[PDB]
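YM 10:42: Glyco_hydro_cc domain-containing protein sequence, as discussed on the call
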Amino acid sequence: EFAQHPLTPNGRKAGSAGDTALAFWKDHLSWWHDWTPAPSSPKGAGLVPVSMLWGGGNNGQKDAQRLQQFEHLNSTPAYVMGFNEPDCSGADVSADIDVNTGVSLWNSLIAPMGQKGAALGSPAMCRQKDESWLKQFNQQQLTKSWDFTSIHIFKSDMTGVQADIDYYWNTYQKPLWVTEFACVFDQNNFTPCTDQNQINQWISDIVDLFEANEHVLAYAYTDGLGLGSVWPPVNSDGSLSQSGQAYLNAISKYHSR
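YM 10:58: structure's back
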């Protein structure tokens, strides 16, 4: 009888999306991802490295490299996530694949990893609570469904964060992982927050909300590009930024054993 993976990695919700701030945050995290099949920054050594199949290998240089690396994995990860934003476009930005193409990749490459014991994460939607892609994908013939629903939260207040959580719990009825989050005026041409005071409070508030919410089992601060000059967790001189320090101070509140 095989032991199942806990859907919170190694007793802590907190993780990182990317590795620029990983050395500074490590001691208060359990896990990280880097959008690749095999997260390998040496800054993460000891944390749970969560695998991803980003896309279908026809929407960018890195997309094609990552599909080939996923096909060549000699091993089964403890946790694997599906596609990054198949409902958005842009070469090496979002996966840009239809539901039919998603089903074929999921059944050929992701479901067999789950048969060998990996915990499976859904594809993550750029449309947030307005998605239709995952609703259609979930109605298709999948050889194995997902264990945790992956979500991206790009919102300017905690009302928007809560509306994303409620939509994905009510609709899919599985535990959630927030696999990327950042403070963004999403309805106003995707304008990233730029007020340091507001960002520091938003970070503090969102970590508290996630830690208290029974349906959120993991979360991860993103360092991806396109989020303005204030959100990045590392300054141009290499030092931890004020935004990076707000995350460090929030996740350390929940690390007391």
